[PDB]
C-alpha cells in the first residue's frame, strides 16, 4: 500500500542463484533481477525474513547460505541486508558462520544535476548492523557546498558509533548523486561510508558504512529522511 513499492534484487541474488524468503506461513522465491514487493512492509523499520540461497551444481540443487534477510524501507529508498547463519564450508557441506553484509541499496535515485542548488538538509534515521537495528543516524547535507557529514549513535557495540566525515556529493556513472567518505572514531580513520541521495527533492539518504574493529570489518546499513 505505501512506497517504496518495489526493490530490484540484484546484489541480493546473483544469476542462477535461487533466493527463498520466508515470513510466517509465506515463502517466496526470487532470482536475479526479480522484484521484492516492499509496498506492504512497515516504513522506517527493519522487516525480517528467513532466507536460504541455493544453486544447481552437477545437476543437483545444493545450499550456499541460510540465515536472516532484513529490509529497511523508506518512501523513496530501501536497502537489504543478510545475516548469515550457515555458509558452504570452503566441499558440499555447510558450516556455522555468522557474518553480516549489505545487499541491495535502491530507490528513486536523485539526479546529481537536479539537486537543490542551495540550503541545508538534516536527515534522521536508522543505522543497523549485526544483531542491532537500534542505531540512530543523523546526517546533514549543505547543498551550497555539496558536502555531507553525519554520525551514528546508540549501537550496542560502542566502536560502531562513528562519525561520517565531511565528503563531497559527486555523480556516479548513472548521473546519480552519491557520497563516499571516511569514518572516524575518536579522531582516527576507522573505515568508510557510502550514501546515495534519493527522492526528486533529495528527501532521503541510504547507504552503508564499513567500520574497522578489533574483531574485523563490520558493516552498517544506513537510511535517513528529512522531516
Amino acid at each position, epitope marked *: 500500500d505505501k512506497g517504496l513499492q518495489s526493490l530490484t534484487l540484484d546484489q541480493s541474488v546473483r544469476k542462477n542463484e535461487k533466493l*527463498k524468503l*520466508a*515470513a*510466517q*506461513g*509465506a*515463502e517466496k522465491t526470487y532470482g536475479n533481477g526479480d522484484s521484492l514487493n516492499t509496498g506492504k512492509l512497515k516504513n522506517d523499520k527493519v522487516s*525480517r*525474513f*528467513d*532466507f*536460504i540461497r*541455493q544453486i544447481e551444481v552437477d545437476g*543437483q*540443487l*545444493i*545450499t550456499l547460505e*541460510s*540465515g*536472516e534477510f532484513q529490509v529497511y524501507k523508506q518512501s523513496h529508498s530501501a536497502l537489504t541486508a543478510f545475516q548469515t*547463519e*550457515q555458509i558452504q564450508d570452503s566441499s*558440499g*557441506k*555447510m558450516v*556455522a558462520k*555468522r557474518q553480516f553484509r549489505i545487499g541491495d541499496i535502491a530507490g528513486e535515485h536523485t539526479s546529481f544535476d537536479k539537486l537543490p542548488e542551495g540550503g541545508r538538509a538534516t536527515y534522521r534515521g536508522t543505522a543497523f548492523g549485526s544483531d542491532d537495528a537500534g542505531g540512530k543516524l543523523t546526517y546533514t547535507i549543505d547543498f551550497a557546498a555539496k558536502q555531507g557529514n553525519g554520525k551514528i549513535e546508540h549501537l550496542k557495540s560502542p566502536e560502531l558509533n562513528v562519525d561520517l566525515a565531511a565528503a563531497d556529493i559527486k555523480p556516479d556513472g548513472k548521473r546519480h548523486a552519491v557520497i563516499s567518505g571516511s569514518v572516524l572514531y575518536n579522531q582516527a580513520e576507522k573505515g568508510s561510508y557510502s550514501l546515495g541521495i534519493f527522492g526528486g527533492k533529495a528527501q532521503e539518504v541510504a547507504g552503508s558504512a564499513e567500520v574497522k574493529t578489533v574483531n574485523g570489518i563490520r558493516h552498517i546499513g544506513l537510511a535517513a529522511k528529512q522531516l
Partner: antibody
Amino acid sequence: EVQLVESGGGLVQPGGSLRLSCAASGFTFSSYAMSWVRQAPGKGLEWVSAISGSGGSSHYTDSVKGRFTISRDNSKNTLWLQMNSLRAEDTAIYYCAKTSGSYYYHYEIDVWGQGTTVTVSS
Amino acid sequence: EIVLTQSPGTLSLSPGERATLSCRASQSVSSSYLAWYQQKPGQAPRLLIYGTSNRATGIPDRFSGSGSGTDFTLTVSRLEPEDFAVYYCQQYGSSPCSFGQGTKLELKR
C-alpha cells in the same frame, strides 16, 4: 552436551490442550531451525511442525494446521508446541528435533530429544 | 507432500551379511535433501546419513548411502548385532517434510 529435553506431555480428553516444552542446551539455539516429530504407537515417524532459527517463519502438516502453534524463546533456549483441540489420532510420542541449519527446511534433524508422551482419550 | 516408499518392509538377515535398504520417492529429491535415521525399540531415532552419502558424527564406515532422482539406498556392508533396528529415510528438500514408513532389520538365527 547438545541436549533436548521435552516436557509437558500427558493425558487429556478430546478437545483438550497441552503445552509441550523442549529445553535446549549445548549449542547456539538461535542459529538452528527446530521441529516437532511424532510417532503414534507402533507406527512410523510423522513430521509435525518446524520453526526457523530466528522464529520468523513456521510451517505445519495440514493435519494440525489451525490446531497446533509452534514457537520459541531464543533468550531462554526453549521450544514450544501449543496443542489445542487435541484429537484421538494426535496420541503419540512427540520428539523435539534440532536441525543442522537456520532455515525451517533443507536441513536434516541432527539431534533428537527423548520424547514426551501425549495421550488423548476419555 | 512427496511420498517415500521403503522396501522391503521387513528384512531378515544374518550378522556379517550385506544389507540393502531401499527408499523410492514419488518425485525426484535432491541428494542434498535426503537422510536416513535409525531407531532401536524404546529409543528415539538417531541421524545416520545426511545429504544421501554423508555419515553423521559417530556413525561407522560400515554404513554408506547412495542414490539420486526417485531411488535411494542405505548399505550396511557387514551387519553388527547393534544394527538390527528400524531405518527411516526422510526428504527435507520440499514442504511438508516426509518420512517413509520404515524398514525393520531383523536378526536371523
